[PDB]
From a paper:
The H. pylori Cag T4SS is of particular interest because of its role in translocating CagA (a bacterial oncoprotein) into host cells, an important step in gastric cancer pathogenesis. Here we report the use of single particle cryo-EM to determine the structure of a transmembrane Cag T4SS complex extracted and purified from H. pylori. The structure can be divided into three major regions: the OMCC, a periplasmic ring complex (PRC), and a central stalk. The OMCC has a structural organization markedly different from that of T4SS OMCCs in other species, and there is an unexpected symmetry mismatch between the 14-fold-symmetric OMCC and a contiguous 17-fold-symmetric PRC.
The C-terminal portion of CagX is comprised of two β-sheets preceded by a long helix. This helix extends from the top of the O-layer through the central chamber into the I-layer of the OMCC. The C-terminal portion of CagY is structurally similar to VirB10 and TraF homologs, and the C-terminal portion of CagX is structurally similar to VirB9 and TraO homologs. Both CagY and CagX are much larger in size than characterized VirB/Tra homologs, and correspondingly, CagX has a long α-helix that is absent in the structures of TraO or VirB9 (4, 5). Analysis of the 5.4 Å structure suggests that the connection between OMCC and PRC may occur by contacts between the 14 α-helices extending from the N-terminus of CagX and the 17 unidentified α-helices extending up from the PRC. The tips of these α-helices are presumed to be flexible, since the corresponding densities are not well defined in the higher resolution maps.
Numbering used by the authors:
A (entry chain S): 349 to 510
B (entry chain R): 419 to 510
């Protein structure tokens, strides 16, 4: 009866406490990973703060089914707010020679302020045509260049880089 | 706008757009030069845009709007002679 080898089979309690050590290290590591990706996913699409409101509009003729309602910006993007009884125009940025420029745009699904349909464009300019085939309406930015940003890289100013 | 004797750093706002920069050749013609937005410089909250030449007139051209930059400090402070941008340079 050599019970001493059973006692020398207790060097894996060192292995036991070290695997509990690296396991709680693993749990705190991926818990910090999940926490920070929760934060950077929550504060990536949060909301934009508005920057200026000084927007006028001028419809030509029978542009009531195309007229925007509440328009503002954030210094980077311009948020148009339509009703739902209105249709969806083709938005255009007036180039400073007077010509037009088709820009990328999307209906923003996150914003539902005041029960509108929000539609952002990715430019800040002074005149915006909203054109369907005959009806159109021109939006005049009388707050152009009054409140810009200083300089940033991401939409919210908690930005990442590599 | 400033320079370092080798590169010329333009500093834009962000409400402005991004022109096509051009170096005026001394006959009066233009010359497209290589340029890049410098990501390291964020002085005064601007968009820095360096070109790789030192000249006297710089056109900044989009389709109808343009602006001419006049170097009234051209050739007043050059370098002596160097090989790299910072003067701790390597060679083989």
């Amino acid at each position: 009866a050599y019970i001493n080898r059973v006692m020398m089979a207790s060097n894996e309690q060192i292995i036991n406490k070290e695997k509990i050590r690296e396991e709680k290290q693993k749990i705190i590591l991926d818990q910090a990973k999940a926490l920070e990706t929760q934060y950077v996913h929550n504060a990536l699409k949060r909301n934009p703060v508005p920057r200026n409101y000084n927007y006028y509009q001028a419809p030509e003729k029978r542009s009531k089914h195309i007229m925007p309602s509440e328009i503002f910006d954030d210094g980077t993007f311009t948020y148009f707010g339509f009703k739902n009884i209105t249709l969806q125009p083709a938005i255009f940025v007036v180039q400073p020679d007077g010509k037009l420029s088709m820009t990328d745009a999307a209906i923003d699904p996150n914003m539902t302020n005041s029960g509108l349909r929000w539609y952002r464009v990715n430019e800040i300019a002074e005149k915006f045509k909203l054109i369907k085939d005959k009806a159109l309406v021109t939006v005049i930015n009388k707050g152009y260049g009054k409140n810009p940003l200083t300089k940033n890289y991401n939409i919210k100013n908690y930005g990442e880089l590599e």
